[PDB]
Design a binder for this molecule. Structure first.
Ligand SMILES: CC(C)C[C@H](N)C(=O)O
Ligand SMILES: CC(C)C[C@H](N)C(=O)O
Ligand code: NA
Ligand code: NA
Lengths: 229, 232
């Protein structure tokens, strides 16, 4: 994105430098009282919450470029006890103390608005996920996930749309009640695991069962969406 | 009341924006309008709705004033989704600003920029907590969480329990008339978590709602700690 690149320059102009993280690192954690604004520039992360019994809930995935804020901008207090875990081999992020961010955003409105619109993409993202699940249940949820991977990481090959992610990342994304749906799907030539890649062969099936996430992607990432429509 | 929201209302009126009044079943904005708007919902209760190919109304999200609902992206001014905003309280008051103008107004005053920004932050965290509670407890979590936020916002401690100070019409409305949801609500009533008495509804087992909607309880504690404190 051009808006993302301009934001990166703005931060670096103000002496905020990128930090590199490796897989399994927490860019921020649920036990830290200081809250941060993360500009994830490159890599893939997941937002998790861990309960007192140790169970890890995967709430949301983010890939660069995107913005994730762990505290409220006005109060600087937590928005939820969440971690941001790196699941790609490496990730690059700019890590800004929440108070420090208020100062710099105030001197510039173009860059405020890039972060503002990122929140809007998350709200409508979450609502679309809910809408698709209400209509088509878990199949809808899973189709949406496959759909976004095709749009974001898909590559046209004679064998189909190759999901161009390191194999380790594919495992991190979930690849007994879930097991059966992916089985029916390959059983129906929607996906296949060949040449150590991942291929979608009926993209229309995914659109059918994830219509509102497809619309979300059309409305929020039209340029990406257009690659496969 | 809500001090940060009252200042926003004054800031809008200082810039010449008048409030409009709406009545139940009206759409403040709709999914077919090419122009997108910023809604500052000042008073009343609303729901965000969509329509599928076959004409079924889907209830996606509820909002109550004071709050901000934006139908288009602030930068591109294009739709964030094919949504309608339907009034479900008897009446509602909202300020309706075209999206292109909101950008000017927030740029000239950063206190009020932050008020709208943090409304979005509350939406994001609310949805993640709703998702988390559904993941753990399914649809029971979603309903317990909905009743929990109603209790915190409209509840008043009484000897008969926490009275919900909302008209019974509005309160039954709040997939419409889903068989699955009706049975969950009536089970809570059967177990005396929420009861009908003397024309009002009283939550008598607040702990039960908190147990099954733990992440929305934390969300409310983090987002409105003073209101959370009143009933804890
Ligand atoms: C989405 C929620 C944060 C909004 C809330 N229901 C309100 O109107 O206050
Ligand atoms: C009854 C509604 C105002 C609740 C909504 N989830 C907010 O808060
Ligand atoms: Na933190
Ligand atoms: Na519209």
């Amino acid at each position: 994105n051009a808006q993302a690149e301009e934001f990166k320059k703005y931060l670096e102009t103000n002496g905020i430098k990128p930090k590199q993280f490796h897989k399994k690192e927490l860019i921020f954690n649920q036990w830290d009282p200081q809250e941060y604004c993360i500009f994830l520039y490159d890599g893939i992360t997941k937002l998790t919450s861990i309960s007192e019994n140790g169970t890890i809930m995967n709430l949301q995935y983010y890939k660069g470029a995107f913005v994730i804020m762990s505290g409220f901008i006005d109060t600087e207090t937590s928005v939820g006890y969440y971690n941001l875990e790196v699941i790609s081999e490496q990730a690059t992020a700019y890590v800004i103390k929440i108070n420090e961010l208020k100062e710099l955003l105030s001197k510039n409105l173009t860059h405020f608005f890039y972060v503002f619109q990122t929140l809007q993409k998350q709200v409508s993202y979450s609502l679309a996920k809910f809408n698709d699940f209400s209509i088509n249940g878990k199949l809808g949820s899973i189709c949406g996930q496959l759909l976004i991977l095709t749009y974001v990481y898909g590559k046209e090959t004679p064998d189909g749309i190759k999901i161009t992610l390191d194999n380790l990342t594919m495992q991190e994304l979930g690849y007994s009640a879930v097991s059966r749906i992916i089985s029916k799907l390959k059983q129906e030539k929607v996906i296949v695991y060949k040449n150590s890649c991942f291929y979608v062969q009926n993209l229309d099936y995914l659109k059918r069962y994830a219509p509102k996430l497809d619309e979300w992607f059309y409305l929020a990432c039209p340029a990406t969406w257009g690659k496969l429509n």
